[PDB]
Amino acid sequence: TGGSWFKILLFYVIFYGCLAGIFIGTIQVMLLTISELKPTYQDRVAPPGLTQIPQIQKTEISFRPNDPKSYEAYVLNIIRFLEKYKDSAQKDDMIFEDCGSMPSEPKERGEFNHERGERKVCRFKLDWLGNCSGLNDESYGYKEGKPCIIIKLNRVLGFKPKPPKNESLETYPLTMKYNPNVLPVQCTGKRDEDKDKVGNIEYFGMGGFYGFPLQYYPYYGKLLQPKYLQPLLAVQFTNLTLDTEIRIECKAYGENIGYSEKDRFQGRFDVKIEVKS
């Protein structure tokens, strides 16, 4: 009967409205706990991952220098990433500041609060990425047999990397360390077979130092520090064997840096590069 149909529709609309209201109320009470400035926990993100710029598919960079189409995607990805690192973009003085060109201490800008509002960010110049800034060679090194990758440490809110101390010789010496305020990065062949075909790797970093300067840390998290620029480290493989697929592993070093066998990108690369003749 019509009255029964009306009652049984009204009961269900009321019941579902009450359920939805209770659900949204619980969600809001939960959200009252968290803050817009810092995550409650960092059980997963705290040991930062190490990632590269070209954003390649199967950890493989494969191109023939004769065909521009082979490296066009890689070059375009690098251009897209570096569009925000141009000197034209970081022109303002209100948001950007001319931080020292030599590596320095981590720059605390107060604790995480809405006080002081938008923090200021150090500016990163492409000129520190020589042979790979794209200012002179728009195609970096892909036109020749000089593949260029750019290393970046995953942004972690309020994370201060502590470089490794002098307890032990971690690898073959860089001989130009400035270890108090530089986070080292080293790329080497994964196997002994790749170490004989990797060649001479030339690093490109701020101040001529081979790693991440510490004046860019900590990161304040996209709200206090929008348009933040993380430091970069260009890596170029000038002389590598043609037609061969070389396995490369790039690692960061530090007490605070950690490595996992399950997660293959936690502080390390595993990139595969081949250059067809």
Partner: protein
């Protein structure tokens, strides 16, 4: 093949027809040819399907087809992933687990299914091996199987009849036809065509029956399966391929769930295809739909609960041969009951005795040791000595341990009844019989119709001869001229004769065979103590005796049968009496056990009371109906239907074994579930046709026990009452368990629909919900089977087999659209809590799953601007899945508490009264703990170790589930029939 008998034919036309001779029998050259033409005199065993085929049929029964489809989809998805190198062996594990679920459920279903046992082995105690046939004018001891139609066979007292024979020459032949009528009373046989019915015509000997005494000659007329017992066994074996009502309800429930699964699968597959999804995501989502929608553990738990109740009942001497028969009692509308051996002790005992113009009643229990009916008075001692002296029956020696009433005694029914009564009331009656040295003349005959004996009293001062003569009351009265009243030998006048006739009629109106007892004190002057007596009756008087009393025998009901029949009728069950005995005894037993109530009357009784004819009176006044086999055989099915509908108390008497089956089939076509109780071979077709057949342990035949679904090992109908109660309780508890499982089904289904529609990262994995199905929800569903009744089980009427389903629309909607959605809401609250505390706010998760699951991206940005690698994202996804699983567990604890009752409240029902539910709650918690902090300490099967606060985020939602259900049941209780009991009660 042929179903008519030839007993109107005398010797000559039978010889001409069958082509045989009485004297010469048949020539072997023709006997062998006829044997080859027709076949051996053996019963054909049925065709038993191989057990392996039955075991394999269970792999496609229930939900197994859907699970096989899911396993196939898992294999296809695994090979698609393997081609594109992105394979994780997770689909293989899912497929293997689904195959294992199918295998285990098939094993449980095979165990649950009724076992098909042949009935031929139950006829082996019958079916003789050797026959005394005559061929070529010489008698030969040839085997029974070599007989053929037309052969001339002789039978001797104490053997089995080799085939269906028509008697030609008989000498005082007695047969026991207990396999055709259920009554063991010896039946006299002759050569005379006496009755129209072949089964009662006195000149036909039946195959597999025993000849008690005498010698008879006959011609074989039926061989093998053409005999009466052949068709009885054919009906018992061939018929009975029907499903139990609980099987039908389970099948309907499976149809509902499968329809839901298929409909949602097709609809959401279309939605997935339309939203630009490739094949792998669509097939994995269909796998998830199948795994969520199927209750993987429910049917095995159903079988386990059935077996638990079966063993509980077996603890009370009630053997359940077929596991599903524990439910058929309860939801039973009609009980069709055999009389002899089932409602009756199958023991012939004295009920009433009439002396001093008074009728006294004696107790007829199987355990009675002493009875008092004013024995201190006179005229009873003389009667007791008449009982002892004029009795020939003898106990078998070495029976001191066994009680009196169970003692095996040699003699006929009346002789043994009198011996048992005397041994009970008088004590040791062998000594009294030994004392008075009886003369060797004890004449009894089938024609004389009186038992005579002359004894000399061993009183020291009397030493007088006392003669006793008992027999039929009319023959007793015509051979007497005085009566005994208070010890005085008052002459029997016209008024005394009229009172005796009235007492005889009253005793005969109760279906009791009545015996007369009288004596005479022979004078010593004419009969001194030095006189010898002759059996020729040439020296003692056979008249002018002193009448004493009238005893009657009833074959009484069992002690616990009347109150059990009353309880069964008070439970709304119609109790129909279907017996092969005569109508008078059947009606008397029906009135004694309460099948026919005292107030109610039959048409014949009303016509007799009103002094009118049966035709004149209309049939709406009589609430009872006694129908004989002759009346029922002419009835059309429509008339039988009207007879069953109109009359509530019905007694079918003198029914053939086929007529019992016809009555059962008529009852079943009334949309009713019918139970048959029996103890004989004639009940086997009816027992096998009934929805449940109940046999008697001590009083039952092997055939009846084999044909039955249930055996009363102590012969107590209280078992039937308790079975009805247990079956109704089982039905209620099955409803509760099914609702509890369907709730978890929907709670599992909702995350996948949300994942497809909104695009969130996978709230819970497909492997994870398998642990809900076969983990935390196995013991709670069993625990719900231990719930006590919320109201009076017995006051409720039997459920309609069509209009009252085990799973109706109310149950399915309340589990699907009310409680499952709430559990999904709680799980999603916990999921968003887990994600937001690590960096992903709820709105950032919408349409994130495509980039979330991309192994290319190892710098995915959260709400705070931090960057996530793929492994950290999948670890957080596993953590969210584990939190969703724990939330479902907590809300299923609440669901377990609320499903404890359907109308009552835990305050009334008792929270801690059923400890199995608390065992199951501990099982839920412990299994979740093992699956989170054990497996999960190492990341495997998408399990991780949770922070302690995630175990309590869904607790308030569980409290909300409980509060909502309590309010629903409270308002159901307050206002019955108020649109709320109709629309919210399941």
């Amino acid at each position: 093949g042929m179903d008519l008998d030839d007993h109107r034919l005398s010797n000559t036309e039978l010889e001409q027809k069958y082509g045989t001779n009485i004297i010469q029998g048949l020539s072997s050259v023709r006997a062998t040819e006829l044997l080859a033409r027709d076949g051996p005199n053996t019963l054909t065993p049925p065709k038993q399907t191989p057990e392996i085929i039955k075991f394999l049929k269970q792999m496609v029964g229930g939900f197994s087809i859907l699970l096989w489809i899911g396993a196939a989809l898992c294999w296809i998805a695994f090979v698609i992933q393997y081609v594109n190198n992105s394979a994780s062996l997770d689909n293989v594990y899912l497929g293997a687990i689904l195959v294992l679920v199918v295998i285990l459920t098939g094993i449980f279903a095979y165990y649950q299914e009724a076992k098909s046992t042949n009935i031929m082995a139950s006829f082996s105690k019958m079916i003789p091996q050797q026959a005394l046939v005559i061929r070529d004018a010489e008698k030969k001891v040839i085997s029974a199987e070599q007989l053929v139609v037309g052969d001339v066979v002789e039978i001797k007292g104490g053997d089995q009849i080799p085939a269906d024979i028509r008697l030609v020459f008989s000498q005082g032949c007695k047969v026991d036809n207990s396999s055709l009528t259920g009554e063991s009373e010896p039946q006299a046989r002759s050569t005379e065509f006496t009755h129209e019915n072949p089964l009662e015509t006195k000149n036909i000997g039946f195959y597999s029956t025993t000849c008690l005494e005498g010698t008879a000659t006959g011609i074989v007329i039926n061989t093998g399966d053409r005999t009466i017992i052949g068709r009885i066994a054919s009906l018992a074996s061939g018929v009975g391929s029907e499903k139990t009502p609980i099987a039908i309800e389970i099948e309907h429930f499976v149809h509902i769930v499968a329809g839901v699964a298929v409909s949602i699968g097709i609809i959401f597959f279309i939605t997935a295809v339309c939203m630009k999804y490739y094949v792998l995501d669509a097939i994995i989502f269909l796998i998830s739909i199948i795994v969520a929608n199927v209750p993987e553990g429910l049917l095995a738990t159903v079988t386990v609960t059935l077996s638990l109740t079966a063993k509980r009942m077996a603890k009370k001497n009630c053997l359940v041969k077929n596991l599903e028969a524990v439910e058929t009692l309860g939801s039973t509308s009609i009980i069709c009951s055999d009389k002899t051996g089932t409602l009756t002790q199958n023991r012939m005992t004295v009920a009433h005795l009439w002396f001093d113009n008074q009728i006294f009643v004696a107790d007829t229990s199987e355990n009675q040791t002493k009875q008092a009916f004013d024995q201190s008075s006179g005229t009873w001692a003389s009667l007791s000595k008449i009982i002892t002296l004029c009795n020939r029956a003898e106990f078998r020696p070495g029976q001191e341990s066994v009680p009196i009433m169970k003692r095996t005694v040699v003699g006929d029914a009346s002789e043994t009844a009198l011996l048992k009564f005397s041994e009970v009331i008088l004590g040791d009656v062998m000594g009294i019989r030994k004392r008075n040295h009886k003369v060797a003349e004890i004449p009894f005959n089938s024609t004389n119709k009186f038992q005579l004996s002359i004894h000399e009293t061993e009183d020291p001062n009397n030493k007088r001869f006392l003669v006793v003569m008992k027999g039929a009351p009319e023959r007793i009265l015509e051979k007497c001229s005085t009566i005994m009243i208070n010890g005085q030998e008052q002459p029997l006048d016209k008024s005394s004769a009229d009172s005796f006739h009235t007492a005889y009629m009253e005793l005969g109106g109760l279906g009791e065979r009545v015996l007369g007892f009288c004596h005479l004190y022979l004078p010593a002057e004419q009969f001194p103590q030095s006189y010898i007596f002759d059996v020729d009756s040439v020296n003692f008087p056979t008249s002018n005796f002193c009448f004493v009393g009238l005893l009657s025998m009833i074959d009484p009901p069992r002690s616990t049968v009347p109150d059990a029949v009353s309880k069964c009728r008070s439970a709304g069950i119609k109790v129909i009496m279907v017996t092969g005995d005569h109508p008078i005894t059947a009606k008397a037993i029906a009135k004694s056990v309460g099948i026919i109530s005292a107030n109610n009357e039959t048409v014949e009784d009303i016509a007799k009371r009103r002094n009118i004819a049966v035709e004149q009176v209309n049939k709406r006044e009589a609430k009872a109906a006694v129908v004989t086999g002759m009346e029922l055989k002419d009835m059309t099915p429509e008339q039988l239907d009207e007879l069953l509908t109109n009359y509530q108390e019905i007694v079918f008497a003198r029914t053939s074994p086929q007529q019992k089956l016809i009555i059962v089939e008529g009852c079943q076509r009334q949309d009713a579930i019918v139970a048959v109780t029996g103890d004989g071979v004639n009940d086997s077709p009816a027992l096998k046709k009934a929805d449940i057949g109940i046999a008697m342990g001590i009083a039952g035949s092997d055939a009846a026990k084999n044909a039955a679904d249930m055996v009363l090992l102590d012969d107590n109908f209280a078992s039937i009452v308790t079975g009805v109660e247990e079956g109704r309780l089982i039905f209620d508890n099955l409803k509760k368990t099914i609702a509890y499982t369907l709730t978890a089904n929907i709670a599992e289904l909702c995350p996948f629909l949300i994942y497809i529609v909104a695009g969130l990262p996978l709230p819970i994995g497909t492997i994870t919900i398998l642990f809900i199905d076969l983990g935390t929800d196995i013991i709670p569903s069993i625990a719900l089977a231990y719930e006590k009744a919320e109201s009076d089980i017995m006051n409720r009427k039997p459920r309609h087999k069509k209009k009252d389903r085990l799973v109706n629309t109310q149950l399915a909607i309340y589990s699907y659209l009310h409680i499952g959605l709430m559990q999904a809401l709680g799980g999603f609250l916990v999921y968003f809590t887990v994600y937001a505390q690590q960096g992903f706010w709820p709105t950032s998760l919408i349409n994130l799953r495509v980039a979330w699951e991309t192994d290319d991206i190892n710098d995915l940005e959260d709400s705070y601007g931090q960057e996530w690698t793929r492994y950290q994202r999948k670890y957080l996804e596993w953590t969210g899945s584990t939190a969703f699983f724990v939330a479902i567990m907590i809300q299923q604890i609440a669901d377990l508490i609320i499903r404890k009752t359907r109308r009552n409240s835990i305050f009334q029902q008792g929270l801690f009264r059923n400890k199995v539910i608390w065992v199951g709650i501990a099982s839920q918690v412990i299994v979740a703990l093992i699956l989170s902090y054990g497996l999960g300490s190492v990341p495997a099967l998408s399990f991780t170790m949770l922070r302690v606060q995630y175990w309590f985020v869904a607790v308030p939602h569980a409290i909300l589930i409980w509060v909502y259900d309590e309010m629903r049941k409270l308002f159901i209780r307050l206002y019955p029939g108020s649109w709320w009991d109709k629309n919210m009660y399941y």
